[PDB]
Each structure stands twice: as structure tokens, then as C-alpha cells.
Amino acid sequence: SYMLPHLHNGWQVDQAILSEEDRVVVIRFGHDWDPTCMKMDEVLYSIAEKVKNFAVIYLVDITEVPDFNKMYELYDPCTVMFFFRNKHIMIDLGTGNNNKINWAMEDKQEMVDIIETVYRGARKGRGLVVSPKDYSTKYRY
């Protein structure tokens, strides 16, 4: 399915990041067949219209669009990238690297909170924002 819009070349990506001025651009780098990307994209579609006011989601295929692999260290099976007014926003998830999510959370509310915090920090002017949760521990007991 994947009703979320897709970008088929680097040109689409680099004018999609600059297209939004009052909304956070979300880019999922990965592959549809990849299950983890499947989980994240299901979560995103579950909240695609909830964050329409202040966020936008685009799906980018690594094979179709491989130019960002070296610059963004796109070596994981899947990454999630946050941009605002041409500036990347780093998120302090507690996983060691603040640039990309690199994992698929099943709860859509966690992603909603993450994108809301990113928007709040980007409109205020901070380039690095703190996640309102710690993902170092999976919280499984």
C-alpha cells in the first residue's frame, strides 16, 4: 500500500526539505520490503493525518535514492530524518547517536510526542532537542 508520498530522486528530496517552512519534514530512508520500515510506515500512516498541521512525511528508497547514504551515514536498514527550514534537527533519544531514530517503535504516541518535541524545538530555534523519553532501555519486564 504505502499511501505516504514517495520521493524517487535526490531532487525530490532536496526540494521537499525546502518546501515546508512551518512544518517538520520527516524522511524515512529504507526499503518497503524491510519489515522494520514496514512497522514504522504503518505507525506513520496511523498518524499521517494527525500531524498534518505541523508535520509532513515522505518515504525515500535507498536503492532509488542512494546519494544521501554517505553524507547521512545511511548504513542502517532504516533511518528517520527530521528537517525544518533546511536545517536538520538532532533528537537526544539516549541511543548514542542523536541524528536518526534507527528503530521502529510500535506505539504511535511515542512518535507523535517525538515529532511534537522536534517541532517545538525547531520553531523556538534550538538545533538539538531532547526526547521526552529514554529509549536506551526497551522498558520490557
Binding site: 500500500s1 504505502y2 499511501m3 508520498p5 514517495h6 526499503h31 518497503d32 520490503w33 528508497d61
Partner: peptide, 13 residues
């Protein structure tokens, strides 16, 4: 649009 991604998914799976 959706069919273009469905064909890519089916071919790769």
C-alpha cells in the same frame, strides 16, 4: 501512485 509502490513491494518480496 499506490500501485507503483505495490509492484515494487511484490517484486522485492
Amino acid at each position: 501512485d499506490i500501485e507503483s509502490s505495490l509492484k515494487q513491494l511484490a517484486e522485492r518480496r
